[PDB]
Design a protein around this nucleic acid. Structure first.
Ligand code: SF4
Ligand code: MG
Ligand code: MG
Ligand code: MG
Ligand code: MG
Ligand code: MG
Ligand code: MG
Ligand code: MG
Ligand code: MG
Ligand code: MG
Ligand code: MG
Ligand code: MG
Ligand code: MG
Ligand code: MG
Ligand code: MG
Ligand code: MG
Ligand code: MG
Ligand code: MG
Ligand code: MG
Ligand code: MG
Ligand code: MG
Ligand code: MG
Ligand code: MG
Ligand code: MG
Ligand code: MG
Ligand code: MG
Ligand code: MG
Ligand code: MG
Ligand code: MG
Ligand code: MG
Ligand code: MG
Ligand code: MG
Ligand code: MG
Ligand code: MG
Ligand code: MG
Ligand code: MG
Ligand code: MG
Ligand code: MG
Ligand code: MG
Ligand code: MG
Ligand code: MG
Ligand code: MG
Ligand code: MG
Ligand code: MG
Ligand code: MG
Ligand code: MG
Ligand code: MG
Ligand code: MG
Ligand code: MG
Ligand code: MG
Ligand code: MG
Ligand code: MG
Ligand code: MG
Ligand code: MG
Ligand code: MG
Ligand code: MG
Ligand code: MG
Ligand code: MG
Ligand code: MG
Ligand code: MG
Ligand code: MG
Ligand code: MG
Ligand code: MG
Ligand code: MG
Ligand code: MG
Ligand code: MG
Ligand code: MG
Ligand code: MG
Ligand code: MG
Ligand code: MG
Ligand code: MG
Ligand code: MG
Ligand code: MG
Ligand code: MG
Ligand code: MG
Ligand code: MG
Ligand code: MG
Ligand code: MG
Ligand code: MG
Lengths: 148, 137, 138, 122, 82, 99, 208
RNA sequence: GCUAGUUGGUGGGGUAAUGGCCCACCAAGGCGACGACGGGUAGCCGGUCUGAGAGGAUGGCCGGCCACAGGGGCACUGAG
RNA sequence: GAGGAAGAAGCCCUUCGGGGUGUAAACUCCUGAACCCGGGACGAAACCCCCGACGAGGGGACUGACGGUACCGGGGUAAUAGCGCCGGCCAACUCCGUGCCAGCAGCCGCGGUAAUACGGAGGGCGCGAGCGUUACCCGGAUUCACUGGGCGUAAAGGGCGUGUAGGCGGCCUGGGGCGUCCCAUGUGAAAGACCACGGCUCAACCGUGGGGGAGCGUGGGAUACGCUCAGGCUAGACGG
RNA sequence: CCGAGGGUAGGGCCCGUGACUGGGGCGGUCGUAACAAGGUAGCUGUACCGGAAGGUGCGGCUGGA
């Protein structure tokens, strides 16, 4: 099976007569380190549920990510509205030179060597959703040729 | 019209994103020469020298992927990305060693030269350089 | 603090004689030093860092207050008598708890006289002096 | 901006403003103490902090902070100062370096003595 | 006049010359006209002298005079052999 | 080589000397874009034969006066008073860039 | 100079027996056996979830503490690596291992690198029959790591040479025993060596 | 907005040598939003530091050019 | 340096059972920085003297500040550790003292009787002949944005035109080849930086070789895009 | 003749300083202008007036009804 890492736990708060009433939310990345990843963000009235829920949604939503000696094929830039992830491919000696949100979503997909950067809003939650949709936008000399 | 090229790539861009089977772009020899590349490179099906109200156009035949599964059945694109590099505002000119390398191989830079309208692979082997006309992937 | 001893001089009636050494139980004047003041022990470099017996006695007998007139040049005096205090270690600057005036204190009339007269006719000082103010009470 | 506008009008380089003009560029500066008092700091705070007005060899007269528990400072104290805003105190933007000139270090200090100019206990 | 002499390099107690052609009125170790080979007076490696004898002749011809120990390592590897 | 350059005569109101305005083009070292710039050369006409409009080549020559260091080499084109206006209309325009 | 203090505590913090003590490390009397929690007042306190910086910090001190070396020298070796051709992490362990004092330990001349370093600093070792006392001598492929033959008649080389007649120096080394020599034949492969060290976590550290 | 040795010319002095370098005369020019004039600050470069790079910042030690020898002016001797 | 307890004393913690400093110490033993003796340099082979011919080659002699130093050889004592931090950023936690006081402070902010945030202690984390601090440069700053930003409401469309310079400019054919691309060649000093080897025991330092690029000069070549010049067009624009 | 510079005289720029005064920032006294239709929708350019916030005239805006 898969490996889990909680990436972001956070208490929110909502208002109601006499009291602010909370609810927690957790963003979790899940991956095999050999090629699949996934991410889901879930919110229960208690921390540990919402973590598990984040997991539930984690596996309910996964990603190809066509590794290549542990790096990615092409360099890729995606914007998830104001937040902006950039991935660059790195030679077999480097390492994962990423943030913390992109560190996880890249380590669990089994990226071993990468150059990256977080221009734009460096908000975790959108930097997350951004790193994913950029992964799931990777292609190969294959699928290019297949398409042409 | 200020940049006939940008116009065309944008005729072509705007076209595909709503999956127009074709789109026609007013014609020039230079214009054709780039299309002639798009085709040859798997980006478009190809093109023919049509005519609207007696006006010499080019009809570009667009090309996509399969219908897909899920709630967004729209195909992926064949030209995912196309944009002017050199420009009337700012000429870009690269010498051969200056020549860029689009999407780690998977894409191209079409670049005018004193030896035809080549691609990056093409000029790098031909040993020349010129005006970075655009980029496709 | 470490300190280079360049030259060593004996002072005679009429001339200054240079000499390459100064044995124990003798007096002379050493050229070179920079930080050394009076009543400060001095040892060769690789030796026991002993401090000679100090000295110590009389506390000042006469006290005189000095008013820095006006007023951005009080501190012409502030740096003046810090140069003084390592030059004469027998006067004593102090500032009054209440009233806040500056109180030079001395070994006698005469002692305060020249110290004061210097402070002006050698440091310009915009200042006058006299009887210290009294800290009263209700 | 168009590429022309940049050709014409360039891009304006950012310039920074010293937060220790008084030092005249030096690491530290020497000075004498004109006033030594306590001051009160702004909300949300509430102490009596020990300050010194100090006239520098640069020309400037600045007010400085006296770090630590207790000091030996008063009028005419010769003193050495370093860059260092104290956040709560209007107009304080340098510190007196204890253990220099007439700045006594702190009696009984045990930790971080490097920073209160106390020598090492035996 | 234009000269052939030893232009010191290396470091302290590590002499490492560079017999050289340069105008007499330069610093010893200043802009020379041409490097015509090194010299390691300490003899620390098999090559403690390699005068470009092809070049070192051209100079001597057109003027260049030399140190009384420039020639020493110029004779030593014979620019003078008849 | 003695630098040769090509430009229009904009002043002949001197005596055995003509002003030759010279354009050059080059790319902006930061912003790529090609840009024009120019320079007026006082040029030696020993036989006074050059006039307004006359696009000519002038050549790097030895000094003849303070600021004359080129002599005209060869008449290359003629009557380009459009370029002459292109430079008067700029000059003239200056009278309204004051306060 | 070197770490020099209480050394079990290194291992107890690091949650991994680093074999620093040498002769004692395999005894039930080592510390890691009796208490394998971190040193000091707070070890039996239920440990807390470690940050990524931590994780790479701990991983780094781990590698570093193993070769028992100054963070100065460590980093400078490491820098040499990055700039050197190909795979940084590997070439790191390479140069980390191509250093003398640790060789002597790999060749069991001495019990631990500490003991090894002493031996090396004392002139009791020689590379190539030239006497060499600098524990940072990067040994290069082809070198003869002698014992000083005037150091030969010495209770401690013997003892350790004696327990080294037919054990296996790794794939890159060649202990001609009896005659006290040995050889540095190959800079290691990554696979050549297992240490409790993620070669990559350390690169990701110095990337901050 | 600037400019009377100012910009050009004829003749001459000066110099190792071109030149408004200096001088007499003739002409009315020369320069400026591509930033003249003016004010500020600064010796420049090889390089150095930082930076993914582009770029930013810097110019002590060493090597190259320049400028200066308390502040000014001046010429003499000399290949200089 | 090796061995050295289910683990001394003191100190810190404690639910009072125990936990921690800690194999750390003591202790056994092995090595042997400094020191002590003995020897002891490379840097210096030319200038000059001798045969020859004052030349080519040969041969002989004098000369060492550092220096009795480096290094070698023999003997040879367990032999300085300190500084920053331990609320979050950020690696490291408890007890007392204190009580918006005394103080901390780079930003958030911490102190009002139970403070992991002040002060001391024990413990811990990081560095180690150093550790910290202030000043400043570049970085994070994609926050002057060329690479690589923006303007309906966040800072940001000129109150609206008309037009000067300027910037930009439709489709076809041809000449030039200014930009642009290519090859050659000169220049691009030395040190530096980079790759290789090599000298000092290592390294710092240093030596030898290699690889050069931008940039500019000179000659040859290309013509697609831009430029200029020359003809034609009518889809822009103006006109009837 | 030119000429360091000295001197007479009139100008331009900069910097420091000055009785007093103008507002600006930081750490009790009067009212209640704004935020809810904020108790007269708010804001607006201008204008006159008023201890003060502000009020009022004229026009505009909706970012009001
Ligand atoms: S003995 Fe056990 S505790 Fe001490 S070092 Fe060797 S491994 Fe760690
Ligand atoms: Mg969702
Ligand atoms: Mg956006
Ligand atoms: Mg943020
Ligand atoms: Mg935020
Ligand atoms: Mg795929
Ligand atoms: Mg004093
Ligand atoms: Mg309070
Ligand atoms: Mg408070
Ligand atoms: Mg005092
Ligand atoms: Mg001599
Ligand atoms: Mg003339
Ligand atoms: Mg021995
Ligand atoms: Mg780094
Ligand atoms: Mg960095
Ligand atoms: Mg005249
Ligand atoms: Mg003449
Ligand atoms: Mg003449
Ligand atoms: Mg003149
Ligand atoms: Mg003349
Ligand atoms: Mg006249
Ligand atoms: Mg110009
Ligand atoms: Mg000035
Ligand atoms: Mg200056
Ligand atoms: Mg950047
Ligand atoms: Mg220099
Ligand atoms: Mg002068
Ligand atoms: Mg002078
Ligand atoms: Mg002087
Ligand atoms: Mg003089
Ligand atoms: Mg027990
Ligand atoms: Mg105990
Ligand atoms: Mg106990
Ligand atoms: Mg021990
Ligand atoms: Mg012994
Ligand atoms: Mg010798
Ligand atoms: Mg003879
Ligand atoms: Mg001796
Ligand atoms: Mg010895
Ligand atoms: Mg001991
Ligand atoms: Mg620290
Ligand atoms: Mg840190
Ligand atoms: Mg922490
Ligand atoms: Mg208790
Ligand atoms: Mg108290
Ligand atoms: Mg503290
Ligand atoms: Mg407490
Ligand atoms: Mg509390
Ligand atoms: Mg505390
Ligand atoms: Mg803290
Ligand atoms: Mg900064
Ligand atoms: Mg930047
Ligand atoms: Mg800024
Ligand atoms: Mg931009
Ligand atoms: Mg922005
Ligand atoms: Mg607004
Ligand atoms: Mg408008
Ligand atoms: Mg207006
Ligand atoms: Mg126009
Ligand atoms: Mg055109
Ligand atoms: Mg045009
Ligand atoms: Mg050309
Ligand atoms: Mg060079
Ligand atoms: Mg070596
Ligand atoms: Mg070299
Ligand atoms: Mg035409
Ligand atoms: Mg005069
Ligand atoms: Mg005068
Ligand atoms: Mg005079
Ligand atoms: Mg004034
Ligand atoms: Mg109201
Ligand atoms: Mg109202
Ligand atoms: Mg109202
Ligand atoms: Mg309202
Ligand atoms: Mg109104
Ligand atoms: Mg009233
Ligand atoms: Mg009213
Ligand atoms: Mg109204
Ligand atoms: Mg509203």
């Amino acid at each position: 099976d898969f490996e889990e890492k909680m990436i972001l736990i956070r208490r929110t708060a909502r208002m109601q007569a006499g009291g602010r009433r909370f609810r927690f939310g957790a963003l979790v990345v899940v991956g095999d380190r050999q090629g699949r990843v996934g991410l889901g963000f879930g919110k229960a009235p208690e921390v540990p549920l919402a973590v598990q829920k984040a997991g539930y949604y984690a596996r309910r939503n996964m990603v190809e990510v066509p590794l290549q000696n542990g790096t990615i094929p092409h360099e890729i830039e995606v914007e998830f509205g104001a937040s902006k992830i950039v991935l660059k491919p790195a030679a077999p000696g480097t390492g994962v030179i990423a943030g913390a949100v992109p560190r996880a979503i890249l380590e669990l997909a089994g990226v071993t060597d990468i150059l990256t950067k977080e221009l734009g809003s460096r908000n975790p939650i959108n930097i997350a959703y951004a790193t994913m949709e950029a992964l799931r936008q990777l292609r190969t000399k294959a699928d290019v040729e297949r398409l042409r | 019209l200020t940049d006939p090229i940008a116009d065309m790539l944008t005729r072509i861009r705007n076209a595909t994103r709503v999956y127009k089977e074709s789109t026609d772009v007013p014609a020039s020899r230079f214009k054709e020469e780039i299309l002639r590349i798009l085709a040859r490179e798997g980006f478009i099906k190809g093109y023919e020298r049509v005519d609207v109200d007696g006006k010499p156009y080019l009809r570009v035949y667009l090309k996509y992927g399969p219908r897909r599964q899920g709630p967004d059945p729209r195909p992926e694109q064949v030209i995912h990305h196309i944009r002017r590099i050199s420009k009337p505002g700012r000429r870009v000119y690269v010498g051969v060693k200056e020549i860029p390398r689009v999407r780690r191989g998977l894409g191209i830079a079409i670049l005018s030269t004193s030896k035809g309208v080549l691609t990056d692979r093409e000029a790098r082997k031909l040993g020349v350089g010129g005006e970075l006309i655009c980029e496709v992937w | 603090r470490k300190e280079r001893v360049a030259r060593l001089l004996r002072m005679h009636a009429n001339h200054r004689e240079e000499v390459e050494e100064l044995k124990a139980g003798d007096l002379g004047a050493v050229v070179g030093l920079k930080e050394t003041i009076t009543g400060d022990t001095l040892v060769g470099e690789d030796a026991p860092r002993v401090i000679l017996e100090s000295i110590e006695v009389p506390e000042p007998v006469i006290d005189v207050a000095i008013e820095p007139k006006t007023k951005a040049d009080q501190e012409k005096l502030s740096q003046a008598l810090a140069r003084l205090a390592e030059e004469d270690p027998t006067f004593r600057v102090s500032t009054h708890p209440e009233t806040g005036q500056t109180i030079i204190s001395g070994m006698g009339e005469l002692h305060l006289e020249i110290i004061v007269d210097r402070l002006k006719r050698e440091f310009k000082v915009d200042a006058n002096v006299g009887k210290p103010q009294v800290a009263y009470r209700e | 901006p168009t590429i022309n506008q940049l050709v014409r009008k360039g891009r304006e380089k950012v310039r920074k403003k010293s937060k220790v003009p008084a030092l005249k560029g030096a690491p530290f500066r020497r000075g004498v103490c004109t006033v030594v008092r306590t001051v009160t700091p702004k909300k949300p705070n509430s102490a009596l902090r020990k300050v010194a007005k100090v006239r520098l060899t640069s020309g400037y007269e600045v007010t400085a902070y006296i770090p630590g528990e207790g000091h030996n400072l008063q009028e005419h104290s010769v003193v050495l100062i370093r860059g260092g805003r104290v956040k709560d105190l209007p107009g304080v933007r340098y510190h007196i370096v204890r253990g220099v000139y007439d700045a006594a270090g702190v009696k009984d200090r045990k930790k971080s003595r490097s920073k209160y100019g106390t020598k090492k206990p035996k | 006049m234009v000269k052939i002499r030893l232009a010191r390099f290396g470091s302290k107690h590590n002499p490492h010359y560079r017999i050289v052609v340069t105008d007499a009125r330069r610093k010893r170790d200043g802009k020379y006209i041409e490097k015509i080979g090194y010299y390691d007076p300490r003899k620390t490696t098999p090559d403690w002298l390699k005068v470009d004898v092809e070049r070192a002749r051209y100079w001597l011809s057109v003027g260049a005079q030399p140190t009384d120990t420039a020639r020493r390592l110029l004779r030593q590897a014979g620019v003078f052999r008849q | 080589p003695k630098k040769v350059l090509t430009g229009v005569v904009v002043s002949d109101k001197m005596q055995k000397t003509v002003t030759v305005l010279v354009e050059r083009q080059f790319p902006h070292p930061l912003y790529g874009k090609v840009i024009k710039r120019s320079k007026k050369y006082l040029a030696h006409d020993p036989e006074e034969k050059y006039k307004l409009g006359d696009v000519v080549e002038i050549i790097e020559s030895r000094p003849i006066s303070k600021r004359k260091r080129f002599r005209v080499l060869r008449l290359v084109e003629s009557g380009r008073m459009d370029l002459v206006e292109k430079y008067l209309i700029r000059r003239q325009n200056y009278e309204s860039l004051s306060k | 100079g070197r770490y020099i203090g209480p050394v079990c505590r290194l291992c107890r913090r690091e949650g991994v027996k680093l074999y620093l003590k040498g002769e004692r490390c395999y005894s039930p009397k080592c510390a890691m056996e009796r208490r394998p929690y971190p040193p000091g007042q707070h070890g039996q306190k239920r440990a807390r979830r470690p940050s990524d910086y931590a994780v790479r910090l701990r991983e780094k001190q781990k590698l570093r503490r193993i070769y028992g070396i100054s963070e100065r020298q460590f980093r400078n070796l490491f820098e040499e690596a990055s700039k050197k051709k190909g795979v940084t992490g590997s070439v790191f362990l390479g140069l980390l291992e191509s250093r003398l004092d640790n060789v002597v330990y790999r060749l069991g001349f001495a019990v631990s690198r500490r003991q090894a370093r002493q031996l090396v600093r004392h002139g009791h070792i020689t590379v190539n029959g030239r006497r060499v006392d600098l524990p940072s001598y990067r040994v290069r492929p082809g070198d003869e790591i002698a014992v000083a033959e005037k150091s030969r008649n010495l209770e401690l080389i013997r003892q350790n040479l004696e327990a080294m007649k037919g054990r296996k120096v790794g794939p890159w080394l060649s202990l001609d025993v009896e005659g006290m020599k040995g050889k540095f034949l190959r800079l290691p492969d990554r696979e050549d060596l297992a240490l409790p060290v993620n070669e990559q976590l350390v690169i990701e550290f110095y990337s901050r």
